[PDB]
């Protein structure tokens, strides 16, 4: 029923934020470093039925790396993340790729350049070519703005199920059936300057 997905990349590139966005819809602003790995089931509904990813969101900080490549064992797919506002994170992509493919020799992998919402982009679009010779899919993404946020999982689902025409579809919508409210009313909604 399910596929093991490993998410790797430098500390602070937005791996955990990206997954959380997909799990709950939320955008986490705080950077709390992942310790070793965190596993989350993530289900998508498609025209070929439900697909379940077991997401192994790994630590990017060396001091919190845990089992490191031990996490990659029997991964069926992967996401390699970098931050387009930090050139060092793109520089380290070949290192993450190297460690990953040594364990996972023939899996579909998506390379993601995160944080494209940030005005001052540092890793120029024209510079991003590592994926070409390595047969990785590439997307510009933002977990903050949701720019292309669905693409990595859509591509992977297509590769894993082996159907180019696979599409996300709407879940069935089943019929639906104190002054903690005062706290809620008097706590400001975040990002009041956003369009929505």
């Amino acid at each position: 029923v399910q596929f093991k997905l490993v998410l790797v990349g430098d500390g602070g590139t937005g791996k955990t934020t990206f997954v959380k966005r997909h799990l709950t819809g939320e955008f986490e602003k705080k950077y709390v470093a992942t310790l070793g790995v965190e596993v989350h089931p993530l289900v998508f509904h498609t025209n070929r039925g439900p697909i379940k990813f077991n997401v192994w969101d790994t630590a990017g900080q060396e001091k919190f790396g845990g089992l490191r490549d031990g996490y990659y064992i029997q991964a069926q797919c992967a996401i390699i993340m970098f931050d387009v506002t930090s050139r060092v994170t793109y520089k380290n992509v070949p290192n993450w790729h190297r460690d990953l493919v040594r364990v996972c020799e023939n899996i579909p992998i998506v390379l993601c350049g995160n944080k494209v919402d940030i005005k001052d982009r540092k890793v120029k679009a024209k510079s991003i070519v590592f994926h070409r010779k390595k047969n990785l899919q590439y997307y510009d993404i933002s977990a903050k703005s949701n720019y292309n946020f669905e693409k990595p999982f859509l591509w992977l689902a297509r590769k894993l199920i082996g159907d180019p025409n696979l599409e996300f579809v709407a879940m069935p919508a089943l019929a639906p059936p104190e002054h903690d409210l005062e706290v809620a009313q008097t706590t400001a909604l975040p990002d009041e300057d956003d369009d929505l």
């Binding site: 955008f27 903690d180 706290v183 975040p190």
Partner: peptide, 16 residues
């Protein structure tokens, strides 16, 4: 629309 849910414990709104 953008929908939020209130996390009571951590006293903050979270996008849904």
């Amino acid at each position: 629309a953008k929908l939020f849910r209130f996390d009571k414990d951590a006293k903050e709104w979270k996008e849904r």
